[PDB]
Amino acid sequence: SFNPWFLTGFSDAECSFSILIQANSKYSTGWRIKPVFAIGLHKKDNELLKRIQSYLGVGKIHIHGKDSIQFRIDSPKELEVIINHFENYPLVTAKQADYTLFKKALDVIKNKEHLSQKGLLKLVGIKASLNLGLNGSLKEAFPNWEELQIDRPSYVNKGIPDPNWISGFASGDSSFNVKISNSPTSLLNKRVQLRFGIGLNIREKALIQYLVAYFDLSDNLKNIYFDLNSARFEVVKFSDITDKIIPFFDKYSIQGKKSQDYQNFKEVADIIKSKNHLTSEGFQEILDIKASMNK
DNA sequence: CCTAGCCCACAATATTAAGGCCATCCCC
DNA sequence: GGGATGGCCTTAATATTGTGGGCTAGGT
Ligand SMILES: [Ca+2]
Ligand SMILES: [Ca+2]
């Protein structure tokens, strides 16, 4: 029906676990509490989110913006489903720490304890270390938030669990693109390369290393980059793309809007492999393909 | 009244999708 | 060594997580 590791991979890429504490005097604490699991996608991926909706058997899909939709689960009863899933197919990235805090928050909630002052203070303390933390509104309303705040759970990376996790994740958080460049020394005075990359935040250094080892690219100790904010890898060696990247994703396939892109990626790979990118007709073919990708 | 169900829609910054150009390879 | 690819480094414009707000119903 729907591979469960892909779902965890896609969720590592795309989901978010929020606990919203919204100011509202119609409530007895002055605050409403909203637990939200959410994946936001372009309107073009409504069918992917519908598949996810049936797989889980819970959740609703709503208009999210001019050309976007959101799959949302906000009920504590229905969130039992999404929690059970991840207990069985755990998040691989640091998101797992946001998830752990979301669980703790949800216990306060399932026990109606968020409707007391003691419970609210607990949630502020949990929310302090969750995603973007407290807005200004909460810091004003709870000046002692620093003391309430809880230790972010520490995150040690235990590895890639299943090849489907990779395609789930890559479906949301990888890039397939055409790298056009000037070439003085070539007869066309222009040049093409294919590029597959994944760019994450530096706290995922270990994951980026585990990924490059998984594809069998780790050879040489390079094409991996650690900027101060970003850990990244990019494959541009045509043989590496042809023999390691494509064969993987032919088997564990990219899903959603990025598959239209993977498909064009391969079209271009077919043109290069046949040396037709050295003719101007072919190089235009590629430029035309490129224009229509990711855009 | 006091709550959650359900829905639409913004924010700012991490991400996504590239682009420049030196180093290096190899068929010839 | 002409003609091509590999790889390190850089970056803009805005999707992407993450969030904010309000209408509604139902129990008590
Ligand atoms: Ca992501
Ligand atoms: Ca993504």
From TrEMBL:
Stated name of the protein: LAGLIDADG endonuclease
Organism: Cryphonectria parasitica (Chestnut blight fungus)
Domain of life: Eukaryota
GO CC aspect terms: mitochondrion
From-to range in the entire protein, with total length: 122 to 416 of 416
Binding positions for Ca(2+) 1 per the UniProt entry: 13, 173
Keywords: Calcium, Endonuclease, Hydrolase, Metal-binding, Mitochondrion, Nuclease
Lineage per the UniProt record: Eukaryota, Fungi, Dikarya, Ascomycota, Pezizomycotina
Residues given in the record as Ca(2+) 2 binding sites: 14, 172-173
UniProt GO MF annotations: endonuclease activity; metal ion binding
Occurrences of domain Homing endonuclease LAGLIDADG (ranges): 7-105, 166-268
